[PDB]
Amino acid sequence: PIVHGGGITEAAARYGGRPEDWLDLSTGINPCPVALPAVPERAWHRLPDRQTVDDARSAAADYYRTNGVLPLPVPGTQSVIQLLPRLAPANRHVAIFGPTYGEYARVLEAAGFAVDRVADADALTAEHGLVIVVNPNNPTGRALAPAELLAIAARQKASGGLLLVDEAFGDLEPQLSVAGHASGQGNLIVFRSFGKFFGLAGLRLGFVVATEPVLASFADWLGPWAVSGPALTISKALMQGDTKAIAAGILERRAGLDAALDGAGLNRIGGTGLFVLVEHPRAALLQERLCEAHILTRKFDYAPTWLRVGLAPDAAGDRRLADALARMELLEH
């Protein structure tokens, strides 16, 4: 399997300490979780009712500005990633803009698809029945403009190709979103994530924006009661609340992280509101040394000079990171 960010259990087992003493900078989750809305006993007790679902879907249509399309709630983005083998044309390649989140290639290659890693729209052909872009990208933060994405979609449509845009990290940049273009474009699918922006990744919740035939396919494949009642209640309440304050809080924490990393002499080469990509010639060794300080960060086997650093919850965490960098022992083995 892929070693995703968030592995505090394994890190604390390997490097010591109690998990709650660790500073976890290895994910892209909002470090300051929004306050929980009320969840009535009924929502805990009953199989999730159609009304609970529909309320969540209307709230999501408003929040993601989907131009009337009701997004489909799904139990976490992984659950629909794993259904992409049923939607992608089976005798065509899949083009993935990368380097990116590795579950797309893992899932599609396990299902026997040929996956082409690409970086530019210029590498896209009619052999690509599905094109995947994480926008903005994880882990580089690269952002394609809406018009580039729609031009990609239009070019693939001529051969019956689909474009999937995973906007997991797009809540801070609503002007990049193509979630309003599903009806007009026709061959466009958008994934949205709930846990990262709202800081409640303990819930497993995502949304799909697509045409009705495609949404009906996803619904059928996922089966009844796929998404928990609490998740649907919480996302309705929070999407109807004040998300501007959430975004402003995130940007404040990101300014704090920038100052810590810059003041430590590290080279920031990308990121989003929720994480920074650092390049350093001994990045893997930096990750290990930070672990020895009980600070977890994300490294990548395919990019030995990359380190992805998520936000700290407060200025004391920023300073904890800076001090660990300043006091770190030789970067040799």
Q: Which residues bind Na ion (CB under 5 A)?
A: 228, 230
For residue 71, the one-letter residue type is P
Q: Which residues of 9-44 are buried (b: 16+ CB within 10 A; e: fewer)?
A: eebbeebeeeeeebbbbbbbbbbeebeeeeeeeebe
Q: Which is nearer to its own copies, 50 or 333 (CB)?
A: 50
Rounded CA separation 236/254 (Å): 26
Choose the contact partner of 50 out of Cl ion, its own copies, Na ion, none; CB within 5 to 8 A by kind. Answer: its own copies
Residues at the contact surface with its own copies, assessed by CB under 8 A: 1-2, 4-10, 19-20, 24, 27, 29, 33, 36, 41-51, 54, 75-76, 78-79, 81-82, 103, 107, 195, 199-204, 220-221, 223-231
Distance, CA of 238 to CA of 322 (rounded, Å): 33
- Smallest gap from Cβ 227 to its own copies, in A, equals 7
Instruction: Tell me, residue by residue from 82 to 101, as one string, x for binding to Cl ion by CB under 5 A and - for no binding.
Output: -------------------x
Nearer to Cl ion, 180 or 317 (CB): 180
Strands (E), 19-154: 23-24, 72-74, 93-97, 115-118, 128-134
Between the two ends of the chain, the Cα-to-Cα distance in Å is: 26
Residue 16 binding: pick among Na ion, Cl ion, its own copies, none (C-beta 5-8 Å cut-off by kind): Cl ion
- Which amino acid would we find at residue 39? V
Contact 318, 312 (CB under 8 A): yes
50-63 and 229-240 helices, crossing angle to 10°: 30
- Identify the CA nearest to 228 among candidates 78, 29, 53: 53
Query: What x/- string results for residues 129 through 148 when contact with Cl ion is judged by CB under 5 A?
Result: ---------x----------
Residue 49 binding target from Cl ion, Na ion, its own copies, none, CB below 5 to 8 Å by type: its own copies
- Residue 99 Cα to chain centre, angstroms: 14
296 binds, among its own copies, Na ion, Cl ion, none (CB under 5 to 8 A by kind): none
Kindly tell me which of 13 and 123 has the beta carbon lying closer to Cl ion.
13
Confirm or reject binding of residue 196 to Cl ion (CB under 5 A): no
Residue 113 token pair: 């698809």
- Identify which of residues 195 and 229 has a Cβ nearer to Cl ion in the complex: 195
184 near Cl ion, judged by CB under 5 A = yes
How far CA 12 is from CA of 19, 320, 333, in Å, comes to 6, 17, 20
Shorter beta-carbon distance to Na ion: residue 107 or 200: 200
Identify what 226 binds: Na ion, Cl ion, its own copies, none; CB under 5 to 8 Å per kind.
its own copies
Minimum separation from the CB atom of position 239 to Cl ion (A)? 13
Q: Which one of Cl ion, Na ion, its own copies, none interacts with residue 98, CB within 5 to 8 A by kind?
A: none
